[PDB]
DNA sequence: GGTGTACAAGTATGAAATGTCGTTT
DNA sequence: AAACGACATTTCATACTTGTACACCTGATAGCAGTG
DNA sequence: GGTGTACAAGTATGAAATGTCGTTT
DNA sequence: AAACGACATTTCATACTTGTACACCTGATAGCAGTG
DNA sequence: GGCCCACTGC
DNA sequence: GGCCCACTGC
């Protein structure tokens, strides 16, 4: 009560051949053995006239099959005109089903990525605006490292609670840790903070309710003199906000006598504070609460020191890679 | 010319034993066929053991193993004190890798799944207070339906455009399509609008710096009578308890129109229908949408409404009774 | 509330494998 | 006997189809301060 | 760059498979 | 001869390991209007 | 003197 | 008869 299948089959026809039997004999022993259920006389010729041509491949070769409706390079066209395609659009085109591209863009090497954030639809003014800043800037870098002058800061907030999703291993079917949503007006704290390639220099905390006004701003840019001048010529750069575009600051920064560097519009990509500080600072922030303001300054004041000095120095030497990115993106968004 | 491997060796045993060949006649024919690479006689024998006992398998019994450092159950254990926890995190516990147990988690039947996002955190009486509601209505509608007679709005935002994250289909190690973050202020309209379960009845559309005060809300309350005078023949209103909504010029109103007001717990967007049915469908339409004027999402949402069937506005009204029994079942936590 | 992807099971394709039977070696 | 040639008949991976599970979306809380 | 998941290639486990050789049927 | 028993020897899926590719995160644009 | 209104970038 | 709270929910 055993049937061979197929291959062990023609397994025995092999075994038969090299014990140098003839085909019609082999197949009186397949019977012998199995029974009936054998093949005819007629394949065991026939695959003796293989293994004449030493192929024991026992495997069939690749039987017919249907011609396929549209062609890989055919689907590839599609993506080099358009990346970001739903599936069912790209089968409208072939005229094949949603389920048909599915598997052949996994017969294909492709995978499904997320669209980047970037931050601005920059106008082509806006991109040349930006592409010489960094230009003029590579000129200067390369006739001098004047890196080691610069002092920069920014101004961010940050919020008493930084909730994110969670992500639950669970059976399929079943349902994730839900979370509970940030309120956007909840308790927060406004961080003005400047910072050289040494370390941090000086920062205010603003509850909400102080605005920053041009009056404020040049009150924290003496306070920020006087902290840089018991802690340490002096290279500014910092965002084109309205209150750092006041003339009043423009000319407190003669006064202090602190060479402003020129700064695109829409560029926190070429702005250390923002780029790579802060960016730091927002995984540190992730699921973490606050009572009160002196539990976030006790926090910074100890995670601020808890870094490296190669840190800081790091963020700021990483300036002129990026300019030549942005060079090489004729202004665009690098990155 | 050929050699045999282990399972094509075995199946010639099971023809030589089916054609009642002794053990060792059989390992002769084997050597005349394949020459001295074949086994020896006392595996013949020991196979012919197995075939008279019917166990015509030929591959082998499952080998020897390394004993398990821990088990399912002790990893399901971790995942039913905490769902969301990193591989690092699990492999520490049990004393194992990270990559250890990212197989032992396709082992079991487990994938990684996000979490929903809900309105609030919610008090134990913010809860009950809802949970009232929601039971405080199922016996009113068991009674009868009055949601023929449920006129709700709500005011919602619109941007004038909605760019959302674009899914390239590439290569790995190529980048996608990036697309450009939403400016929070930039260009924008406030939508007031109240629809019964018959379609839209009147809506507004607020330039920004329009704030909407009591005295602005009861304006849009007339022009809503107004507009609801001119379609139909009591009125049950529905709406969130915001502070021009709660106030007392208003509830005045409401009285003088003649309008009960419906019973509405706090931070329940997924008991309000304008929300959680009219302008969730909204949502979608709007991905990737771009205005250039005013009249430019008026002449888009009057299109759209009308474009709608009566039946989906009936719906999301009808589907009320549904979700008041699931906010009871869940003790007026946020039924997902 | 609506959309997008993947698994499942059904169905044609069509050349390779098989079977039938008079003829050749 | 044993193998063959010419014909009809059948097998099965393949490249699609429609039906459908289910992950994840969607709705959920209004800016400022400069300059001209 | 920091973190989290999955794909490599190397390495032990250990019982099932194999081999050797005097002994039994 | 053929099969066996008792012993030494070897095979290989398995359940881990460390090394490493690479997807996706992170930073970027300040509320209102009631009531007591 | 004042206020407003329309750009500008954070 | 005017304005600054600390609450509140969208
Ligand atoms: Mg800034
Ligand atoms: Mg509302």
Same mark, same amino acid.
């Given at each position: 009560?055993?049937?061979?299948?197929?291959?062990?089959?023609?397994?025995? %026809?092999?075994?038969?051949?090299?014990?140098?039997?003839?085909?019609?004999?082999?197949?009186?022993?397949?019977? $012998?053995?199995?029974?009936?259920?054998?093949?005819?006389?007629?394949?065991?010729?026939?695959? &003796?006239?293989? &293994?004449?041509?030493?192929?024991? #491949?026992? #495997?069939?070769?690749?039987?017919?099959?249907?011609?396929?409706?549209?062609?890989?390079? $055919?689907?590839?066209?599609?993506?080099?005109?358009?990346?970001?395609?739903?599936?069912?659009?790209?089968?409208?085109?072939?005229?094949?089903?949603?389920?048909?591209?599915?598997?052949?863009?996994?017969?294909?090497?492709? +995978?499904?990525?997320?669209?980047?954030?970037?931050?601005?639809?920059?106008? $082509?003014?806006?991109?040349?605006?930006?592409? =010489?800043?960094? $230009?003029?800037?590579?000129?200067?870098?390369?006739?001098?490292?004047?890196?080691?002058? +610069?002092?920069?800061?920014?101004?961010?907030?940050?919020?008493?609670? =930084?909730?994110?999703?969670?992500?639950?291993?669970?059976?399929?079917?079943?349902?994730?840790?839900?979370?509970?949503?940030?309120?956007?007006?909840?308790?927060?704290?406004?961080?003005?903070?400047?910072? #050289?390639?040494?370390?941090?220099?000086?920062?205010?905390?603003?509850?909400?309710?102080?605005?920053?006004?041009?009056?404020?701003?040049?009150?924290?840019?003496?306070?920020?003199?006087?902290?840089?001048?018991?802690?340490?010529?002096?290279?500014?750069?910092?965002?084109?906000?309205?209150?750092?575009?006041?003339?009043?600051?423009?000319?407190? %920064?003669?006064?202090?006598?602190?060479?402003?560097?020129?700064?695109?519009?829409?560029?926190?990509?070429?702005?250390?504070?923002?780029?790579?500080?802060?960016?730091?600072?927002?995984?540190?922030?992730?699921?973490?609460?606050?009572?009160?303001?002196?539990?976030?300054?006790?926090?910074?004041?100890?995670?601020?020191?808890?870094?490296?000095?190669? &840190?800081?120095?790091?963020?700021?030497?990483?300036?002129?890679?990026?300019?030549?990115?942005?060079?090489?993106?004729?202004?665009?968004? &690098?990155?």
């Amino acid at each position: 009560s055993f049937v061979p299948n197929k291959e062990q089959t023609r397994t025995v %026809l092999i075994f038969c051949f090299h014990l140098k039997k003839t085909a019609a004999e082999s197949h009186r022993m397949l019977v $012998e053995a199995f029974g009936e259920q054998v093949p005819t006389v007629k394949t065991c010729e026939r695959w &003796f006239q293989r &293994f004449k041509s030493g192929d024991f #491949d026992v #495997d069939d070769k690749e039987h017919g099959k249907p011609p396929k409706r549209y062609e890989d390079a $055919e689907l590839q066209a599609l993506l080099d005109e358009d990346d970001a395609q739903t599936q069912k659009q790209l089968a409208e085109q072939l005229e094949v089903s949603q389920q048909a591209v599915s598997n052949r863009l996994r017969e294909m090497g492709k +995978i499904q990525k997320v669209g980047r954030w970037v931050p601005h639809e920059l106008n $082509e003014r806006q991109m040349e605006r930006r592409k =010489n800043t960094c $230009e003029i800037l590579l000129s200067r870098y390369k006739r001098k490292s004047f890196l080691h002058r +610069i002092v920069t800061g920014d101004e961010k907030w940050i919020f008493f609670v =930084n909730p994110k999703r969670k992500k639950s291993y669970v059976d399929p079917g079943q349902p994730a840790t839900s979370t509970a949503r940030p309120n956007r007006f909840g308790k927060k704290t406004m961080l003005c903070v400047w910072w #050289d390639q040494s370390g941090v220099i000086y920062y205010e905390l603003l509850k909400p309710g102080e605005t920053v006004n041009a009056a404020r701003y040049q009150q924290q840019l003496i306070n920020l003199n006087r902290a840089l001048q018991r802690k340490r010529r002096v290279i500014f750069l910092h965002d084109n906000a309205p209150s750092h575009t006041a003339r009043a600051v423009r000319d407190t %920064l003669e006064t202090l006598n602190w060479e402003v560097l020129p700064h695109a519009a829409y560029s926190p990509d070429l702005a250390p504070s923002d780029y790579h500080l802060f960016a730091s600072m927002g995984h540190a922030l992730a699921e973490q609460r606050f009572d009160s303001y002196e539990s976030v300054k006790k926090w910074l004041d100890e995670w601020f020191a808890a870094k490296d000095d190669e &840190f800081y120095w790091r963020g700021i030497h990483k300036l002129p890679e990026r300019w030549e990115k942005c060079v090489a993106s004729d202004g665009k968004y &690098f990155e």
